[PDB]
Amino acid sequence: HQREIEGLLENIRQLSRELRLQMLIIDNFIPQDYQEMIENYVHWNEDIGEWQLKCVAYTGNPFEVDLSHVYL
Amino acid sequence: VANINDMDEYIELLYEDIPDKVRGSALILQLARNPDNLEELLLNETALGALARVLREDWKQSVELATNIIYIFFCFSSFSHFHGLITHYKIGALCMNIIDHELKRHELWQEELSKKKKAVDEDLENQTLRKDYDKTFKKYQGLVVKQEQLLRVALYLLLNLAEDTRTELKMRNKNIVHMLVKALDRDNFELLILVVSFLKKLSIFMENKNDMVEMDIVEKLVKMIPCEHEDLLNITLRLLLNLSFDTGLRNKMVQVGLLPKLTALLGNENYKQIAMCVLYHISMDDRFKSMFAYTDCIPQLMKMLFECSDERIDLELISFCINLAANKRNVQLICEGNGLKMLMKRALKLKDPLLMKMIRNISQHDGPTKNLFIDYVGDLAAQISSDEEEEFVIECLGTLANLTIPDLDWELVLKEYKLVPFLKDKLKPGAAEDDLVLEVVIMIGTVSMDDSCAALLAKSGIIPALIELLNAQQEDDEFVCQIIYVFYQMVFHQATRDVIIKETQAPAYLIDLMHDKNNEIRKVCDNTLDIIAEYDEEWAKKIQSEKFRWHNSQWLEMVE
Amino acid sequence: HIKERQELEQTQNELTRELKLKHLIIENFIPLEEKNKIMNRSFFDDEEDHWKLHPITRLENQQMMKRPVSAVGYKRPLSQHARMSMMIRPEPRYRAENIMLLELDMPSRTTRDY
Amino acid sequence: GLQAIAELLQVDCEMYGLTNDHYSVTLRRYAGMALTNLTFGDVANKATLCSMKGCMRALVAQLKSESEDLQQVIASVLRNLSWRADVNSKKTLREVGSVKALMECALEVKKESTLKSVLSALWNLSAHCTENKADICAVDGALAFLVGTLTYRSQTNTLAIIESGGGILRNVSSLIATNEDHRQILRENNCLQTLLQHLKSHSLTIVSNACGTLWNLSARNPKDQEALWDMGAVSMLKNLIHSKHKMIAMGSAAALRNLMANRPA
């Protein structure tokens, strides 16, 4: 059980590192105001285990030499 | 010999006995060889008509009778008015099939002679090999020699009718150039020179060029430009000069291997102009410029550039050298042996902008050619002070601008020379013409990799002039890209960063066009604003807010 | 042990919860180019246990960007006036290369020999 | 094995017909799951199963049985038969009239899982040829229920069934674009209102389906055009032009084109 707990702790550490990096990127791109506005247009579906983003269909994501004129 | 001073009883014998047709043709040749008898021969009626009548079918078996076709109408064809009688008697049209079926029969002879060597397995000096083979070889040599002469004089009459546009159009309708190129395979100087003169005469027009292009000429002329006859090389080089205009023909020339012989002819002859013009036309694409430096062009071009004593050096050599200088492989060879020093000396002893263009093109490159240029900043900078018209200062300025070595401290040059007040003055929209101002902007950018000049640039008031220039020249992507690149130069030197951020509205102009149509302008804006964001947080917040209002613009419009 | 494991699993659920939040927000609202830029710039600091950024001006590779060759596609930067003058005038002053316009070799007089 | 199972199933359904015996139901359960598992991703198995006309003749009759699990399993089997079927298999499936019995059965289906299977099988079949769309539009109370699955409040909060309904409606709207009666019975339930909202939906498939429907219905009639104009479809249709997904882009652009040609005059 000690190995299982150690692996779980390592998973927590990796997940925390990853999400901290993600927040870094979201800070250099999206302002805090629009981070908050985005959070009001997203919902959690527990049955499927995935997010839901309303309006997912509206998100943002001559000098060539030509000497042919000489001949008539 | 039967020298005569009269007429009749000679053309009379030309339609009654085959063996004596050739002797009569030779006698007519001797009669017409001198020019004083031409008028009497022309006034002799039913004389050319009888020759044409015996000429319409007796040109396929003897070959010696094909001498009778011309050498009499030849001396007629040397005068303009007799060309009307030439179309009257239609010697051109019969000459057409004359040349055509002689070429056909020459190929037939080639194939029988080639297949007669197949009997070399058993040689017995009889009909199998030798004996009759020797006889066929002898009559071959006689027939081919006389027929080559006959073609020489026949196409000679063809040139003497080629002066007219309509006559040449009729001649080109008959697909001359095919058999013309076929005749180029023969080995005899004079007929070849008539062929190449005729072909050059046709080579100005694009219709005859298009009839020429399908069958290779350049490969046939490759083994011929080292020929020993001067007029041959002259008119052949003129013909290649007419053939360089077409791009496809020029790639044919490059792939066949015409360049080494062209450069050899450019070595030292009376063919300087023509060979050098041809070589320059080949240079006009980037692919062929690199093949020059592989011991083909030879650095002798620099030699005859150095010798030429005049106020204005000849245009052709300087143009060839300039277009050679577009490529680093030629540029490295140009500066070999320190030619750039005498290049300076010539450039500065007089106002010759063309050598300045050549060395400017030399200086656009990263290699050691850039490194050598560090020593010429004062000598160039002296003439930068608006001394010799305008067509000279631009080249000096631009040559200096491309001299981007990060280790070279420029403040000495700016305070001694370079007229920083004139740099500011030129940035006025109404000061000078736009190319000079753009070169000044390249200068302002290239003086900014040195920290010592940062304080001078910040104090000089150049930034307002740059901003006004950007505002007044925002339409063209070149000015915008280069000014924004100057801003990129000049931000992260710790002295002009503060001015740009807090005194001028430049980062706003960077916000407005963060994402423009052109990839380069947008890339420069992105890198400059990325460098701005670290030292200033308000412009960073605005940098997010804009381009977030653009990245998801329709999203926000739909929510609103 | 069961209670601790359940609490830890709840922690994992919430961690991937917010991680998916960030991933979806990036995958809908953030371009790939800016993600790559920030990924190249950033670096993790083990001492302070948080992610940091390498400043551009303080990067080890302080070698500066190389000047654009041309915004209009030439071999060198070119003013619009220079392009117009290249198009209309035969003045070699505005061109890098290809400055001479040779003429077609006009056909001479036909008199050589024989 | 596949042929043996299909033979046993068809002979059982022939010799017992529609029976409520539990053992027969369990045997047919085994057979149906076996066919669904065996036909998944095997084109050759699909062709072999569709070459047996008696098999699917036995299958289609099973849709009318009282057990809705049988309905769901037959729907899944017809799904995997109709998915990317060849010309012969499509024609053979059309011949046995599976479309009619499937879509009638959906009206009587009460379980969510069975309804999902049936509507998904209909969506797979509805793109084969215009005859399937004709049979879909010919059943009584057909479109009135097809529109009813768009606003379906799923018990398990899944968007499968609404995606299926949007896909079927897009597929069959080509015939709905030609007859006034079908458009009228669409207007009776305010279908356009549920179609426009689908543009802002959480699922991209739903947006694509809605764009397809808006493309199909807005063309060649003034009444629906002005109805869409009143509800402001022009703004959301214009915003969707530059989408990355092909179907969404074409649907939005074409719908805006049809609306553009009928500006007030």
Author numbering:
A (entry chain A): 569 to 629, 645 to 655
B (entry chain C): 129 to 688
C (entry chain B): 562 to 675
D (entry chain D): 469 to 733
Q: What does the publication say?
A:
Ultimately, we successfully reconstructed the structure of the core ARM repeats of APC in complex with ABK. Based on the cryo-EM and XL-MS results, we found unexpectedly that the C-terminal ARM repeats of APC bind KIF3/KAP3 specifically at the ABK interface 1 region. The ABKC interface primarily involves the βh-310-αB segment within the H-βh-H of KIF3A, which contributes 11 residues, and the C-terminal helix of KAP3, which engages three residues, collectively interacting with 17 residues of the APCARM. Within this interface, the 310-αB region of KIF3A plays a central role, with Val624, Ala625, and Tyr626 from the 310-helix inserting into a hydrophobic pocket formed at the C-terminal region of APCARM. As the αB region within the KIF3A H-βh-H domain was not fully built in the final map, we incorporated the KIF3A tail–linking loop region from the docking model for further MD-based free energy calculations. These calculations revealed that the KIF3A-APCARM interaction contributes the dominant binding energy—approximately three times greater than that of the KAP3-APCARM interaction—while KIF3B showed no contribution to APCARM binding.
Heterotrimeric kinesin-2 (KIF3/KAP3 in mammals) is one of the most widely expressed and abundant kinesins functioning as a complex of heterodimeric KIF3 motor (KIF3A/KIF3B or KIF3A/KIF3C) and the armadillo repeat (ARM)–containing adaptor KAP3 (16–18). Here, we present high-resolution cryo–electron microscopy structures of the heterotrimeric kinesin-2 complex (KIF3A/KIF3B/KAP3) bound to the cargo protein APC. Our findings reveal a previously uncharacterized KIF3 tail hook-like motif, termed the “HAC” domain, which mediates binding to both KAP3 adaptor and APC cargo.
